Amino acid sequence: VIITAVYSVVFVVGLVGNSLVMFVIIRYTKMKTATNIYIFNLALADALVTTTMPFQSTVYLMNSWPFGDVLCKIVLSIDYYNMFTSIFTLTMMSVDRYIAVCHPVKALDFRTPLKAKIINICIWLLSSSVGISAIVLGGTKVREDVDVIECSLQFPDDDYSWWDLFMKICVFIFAFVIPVLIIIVCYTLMILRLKSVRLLSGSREKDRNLRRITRLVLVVVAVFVVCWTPIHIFILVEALGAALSSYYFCIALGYTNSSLNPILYAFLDENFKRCFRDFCFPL
Amino acid sequence: IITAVYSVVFVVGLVGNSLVMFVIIRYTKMKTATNIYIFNLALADALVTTTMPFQSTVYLMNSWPFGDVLCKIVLSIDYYNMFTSIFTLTMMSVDRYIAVCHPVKALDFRTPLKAKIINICIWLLSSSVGISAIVLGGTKVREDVDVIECSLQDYSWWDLFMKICVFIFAFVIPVLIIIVCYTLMILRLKSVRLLSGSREKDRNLRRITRLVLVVVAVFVVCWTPIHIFILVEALGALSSYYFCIALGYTNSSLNPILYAFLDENFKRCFRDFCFP
Amino acid sequence: QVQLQESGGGLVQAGESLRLSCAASGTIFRLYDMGWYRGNQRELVASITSGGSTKYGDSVKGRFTISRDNAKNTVYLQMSSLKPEDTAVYYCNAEYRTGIWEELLDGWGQGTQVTVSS
Amino acid sequence: QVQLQESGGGLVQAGESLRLSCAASGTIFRLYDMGWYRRELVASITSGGSTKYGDSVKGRFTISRDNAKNTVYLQMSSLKPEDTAVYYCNAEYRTGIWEELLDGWGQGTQVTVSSHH
Ligand SMILES: CC(C)[C@@H](CN1CC[C@@](C)(c2cccc(O)c2)[C@@H](C)C1)NC(=O)[C@H]1Cc2ccc(O)cc2CN1
Ligand SMILES: CC(C)[C@@H](CN1CC[C@@](C)(c2cccc(O)c2)[C@@H](C)C1)NC(=O)[C@H]1Cc2ccc(O)cc2CN1
Ligand SMILES: CC(C)CCC[C@@H](C)[C@H]1CC[C@H]2[C@@H]3CC=C4C[C@@H](O)CC[C@]4(C)[C@H]3CC[C@]12C
């Protein structure tokens, strides 16, 4: 009934919350942690997917794509850039966290806000592989037995069935499973140190934050897998094999996580919580 | 077109006013006479913010798809907010006059309980004309076009009479009292050095009189174009009408934001409640 | 902001005269009371209201003379027949208000050094 | 959220021997270093039983640990009158795996050495 607004609530949050996270890290100098530079990237990707919230909405109601190619080419790419940039940023966060608590001496030269921006730029280039290509191959095509307009990437019709199923697998495997694996390895090697080590760095304060931020990252990673696992096994079940509203539900979760992350940093960081309070409400 | 801004303002005023309303209850530190009035005014701002789906629904279909019982309720809720809001702004401005121009008599005349009684008296008058909108209001089909109408319903003159009656007693007289109240307060804020004998009372009386002044000033700017519009249309464009309604719904949701920037104590609880 | 500008102190031999000024520069919405305050240092020596009501210290009456120029927001203190007992630091003080809605404030100055030879 | 239980101080004649114990009780995840302080160090011991003694304790004191019972024991031998002070127990704990490293002090147990024999 009133879902037409709760969809706008999330839309504003993910578009304002992430913009806020990006601006705070840019302007305020104290907020240039190696980890925060990664969150800037993640926020950026989340802001972009949030920009496609309306477009995906109108498709829900109308059921046919009514925009132009120039928008189908831009949304389809504003998407691949998000699917890859986000998961490659979490996987680096968790690796950055690994070499922060399981390699404290080497980290004295390996973890720096310049090195992190480099890995962030590197991630957008690797994501451009599939991201720029979507702008090229992105186009609209009238469905055959539907008489509706479809927006999707265009492949040579010679062996469509093959390259489709192969791409889907490589997406699921290399953008949903090899990344999660790395994180699970990262994080096991890490709680094993934290269950027995007395002090990770020289200060108790370093060790206070080293443990604390790694818990934030673990919660961000946790929310991500929970929201992103249903859609990934759904794109893969329909490939190897009907009034299925599951597709919009699994997209609902994925758009929740886009808007949930600005709030998670505000809740799981005493620094983000402090920078917001001294920005929105300067006492 | 883009319509999320309408839903955006719906949640700010529904959550803000209910936050403003909760903070005064839970935290005993800020149960002030002025905040009893702000509570009352947020309560109004909350109740009229629960009609925004109704207004949008009528905006698209151009008709009343709800029943008559939901046409009478929202007509009720509409007047209760119309009168409660302006009568609360008039009694804050009188409260403020007493606070800065009559300090000797404000020791015994500005107790938060006394504020409650005056705000109880305000709802008695306002729901009284909100009970009449239940009687007078109702559903009916327009003569020619096939569209349901939710309005007040025996003579077309008594409609222009009541509208004139509302303009005089719900807007013009109350604004005359505020205009007067603040004319005498600004003289004494400029003439007097130390207002209440304590350099901290003086700061607070001045700081909070500015808060009410903005809150009132914002309120007339939002409600002037809608009040002169219902009176001009009685002497007988539609895109102007909704821009007069958008102003009034914006005001209902601005007030929480205004308390945050104008009151350091509201600014302080929005922090420890949102960012502990 | 507001800044108190002081001038007129220094080393001087006894029985000589000095003159102290204190201008209140800055965003002043209304100045209220300006004055000079020489164990604990803070002790009244001369204060004048914006009307002209003066009040001198017990020891300073008869020799010092305070005067206010409301047009220039400056106050002047004419010290005559100085003695070595009068040697101290003299701090200037102004009650001002930056705006209609702002609080009342008490602004001190850096301090002027006076050292009367015997 | 940590309670310590101390024992074994009091009045004793010089060249006599005492024994202190300290029991770390509470809701904790893992204890790290327990030891006795007086505030200079006298004796401390890790989870792995590696011990560190103050310079004023020329092998006279010896500190054991029972990790099973979260208790640390200080065997003080050959007491001198220059040992009279308040002996504070210390227990490093962590309220949870992601949480901060912080220790908790004990009430203290008074030890007094006097005269001779
Ligand atoms: C929020 C995330 C989960 C959305 C964002 N995306 C959702 C679908 C979208 C790309 C789109 C584009 C064009 C038409 C249309 O109906 C929908 C546009 C609304 C934006 N993207 C996706 O769902 C990802 C999910 C996914 C999973 C497996 C796979 O092999 C490829 C893909 C690519 N789209
Ligand atoms: C927030 C404010 C600006 C809205 C509240 N809004 C007004 C429109 C509304 C009453 C409604 C109810 C039923 C049908 C319909 O089309 C509209 C419902 C959505 C509530 N109230 C009004 O517009 C006030 C304005 C006004 C001005 C003069 C006068 O004599 C009577 C009235 C009563 N309606
Ligand atoms: C439109 C509605 C609010 C009309 C309300 C009328 C009454 C209740 C209001 C309107 C004018 C108000 C007065 C305005 C100013 C003064 C003078 C002051 O020395 C004592 C309070 C007193 C006397 C106020 C009491 C309340 C008051 C009398």
Author numbering:
A (entry chain A): 60 to 300, 307 to 348
B (entry chain B): 61 to 213, 218 to 300, 308 to 347
C (entry chain C): 3 to 40, 44 to 123
D (entry chain D): 3 to 40, 47 to 125
Paper quotes:
The KOR has emerged as an important therapeutic target because G protein biased KOR agonists are reported to possess analgesic activity without the liabilities of addiction and respiratory depression associated with conventional opioid analgesics which target the μ receptor. We previously reported two allosteric nanobodies against KOR—a positive allosteric nanobody (Nb39), and a negative allosteric nanobody (Nb6). Here we demonstrated that Nb6 reduces 3H-U69,593 binding by stabilizing an inactive state of KOR, which is unfavorable for agonist binding, while Nb39 increases radioligand binding by stabilizing an active-like state. To better understand where Nb6 binds to the receptor and how it allosterically modulates the ligand binding, we solve the complex structure of the KOR bound to the inverse agonist JDTic in the presence of Nb6.
As JDTic promotes a stable KOR–Nb6 complex, the X-ray structure of KOR–JDTic–Nb6 was determined to 3.3 Å resolution in the space group P21221 with two monomers per asymmetric unit. Furthermore, because the two monomers (chain A and B) are nearly identical, we focused on the chain A complex for subsequent analysis. The overall structure of KOR–Nb6 is reminiscent of the inactive-state KOR–JDTic structure although substantial differences were observed at both extracellular [transmembrane helical (TM) 1 and 5, extracellular loop (ECL) 2 and 3] and intracellular regions [TM5, TM6 and intracellular loop (ICL) 2]. The formation of this lid may explain why the binding kinetics (e.g., kon and koff) in KOR preincubated with Nb6 were slightly changed (t1/2 increases ~2-fold) compared to that in the untreated KOR. It is also noteworthy that interactions between Nb6 and TM5/TM6 facilitate a mild inward movement of TM6 (~2 Å) by measuring the distance between Cα atoms of D2666.27 (superscript denotes Ballesteros–Weinstein numbering). The Complementarity-determining region 3 (CDR3) loop of Nb6 inserts into a crevice between TM5 and TM6, where it forms major interactions with KOR. This interface is distinct from previously reported nanobody-GPCR interfaces (e.g., β2AR-Nb60, β2AR-Nb80, M2R-Nb9-8, MOR-Nb39) and the active-state-like KOR–Nb39 interfaces, all of which bind via the intracellular core region which is also critical for G protein and/or β-arrestin40 interactions. For instance, W106 in Nb6 extends into the crevice and forms hydrophobic interactions with L2535.65 and the backbone of R2746.35, likely anchoring TM5 and TM6, and preventing the latter from moving outward. R102 in Nb6 forms ionic interactions with two charged residues (D2666.27 and R2706.31) in the receptor, providing an H-bond network linking TM5 and TM6. All of these interactions appear to contribute to the high affinity of the KOR–Nb6 interaction because mutations of these residues completely abolish the binding of Nb6 to the KOR in BRET assays.
